[PDB]
Amino acid sequence: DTALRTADSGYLTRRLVDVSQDVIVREHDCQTERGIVVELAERAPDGTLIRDPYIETS
């Protein structure tokens, strides 16, 4: 299973690289108001802020 999986992984990386072969930084800031919302901690039912587990990557 190791061999076929590394083959497919290499092909996938080739695909992803090609699609993103032209995503490079150009400007410092666009000042665009638009954005996304990230949840961070979720309100506890008793009332408390527990840090969301997958915050370090979000």
Partner 1 sequence: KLHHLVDDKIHARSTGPYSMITQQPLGGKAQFGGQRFGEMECWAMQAYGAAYTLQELLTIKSDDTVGRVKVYEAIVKGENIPEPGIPESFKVLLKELQ
Partner 2 sequence: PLKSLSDLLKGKQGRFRQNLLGKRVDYSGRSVIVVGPQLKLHQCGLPKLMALELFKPFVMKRLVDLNHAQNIKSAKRMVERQRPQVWDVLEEVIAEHPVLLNRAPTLHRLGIQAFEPMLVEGKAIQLHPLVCEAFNADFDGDQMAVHLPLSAEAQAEARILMLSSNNILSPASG
Partner 3 sequence: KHIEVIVRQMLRRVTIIDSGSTEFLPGSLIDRAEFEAENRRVVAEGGEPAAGRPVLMGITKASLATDSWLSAASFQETTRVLTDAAINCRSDKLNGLKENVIIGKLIPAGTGINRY
Judged by the rule CB under 8 A, the positions of this chain that interact with partner 3 are 15-16, 18-24
By the rule CB under 7 A, 7 interacts with DNA:
yes
- Token pair for 25: 């930084």
Closer residue to partner 2 (CB): 23 or 30: 23
Is there a binding annotation on residue 30?
A: yes
- Asked if residue 57 lies in contact with residue 51, where contact means CB atoms within 8 angstroms, the answer is no
| CB neighbour class for 20 (10 Å; exposed up to 12, middle 13-18, buried from 19) | exposed
| Chosen residue from 3, 17, 30, 38 binding partner 1 by CB under 8 A | 17
Q: Which residues of the chain form contacts with partner 1 (CB under 8 A)?
A: 13-14, 17
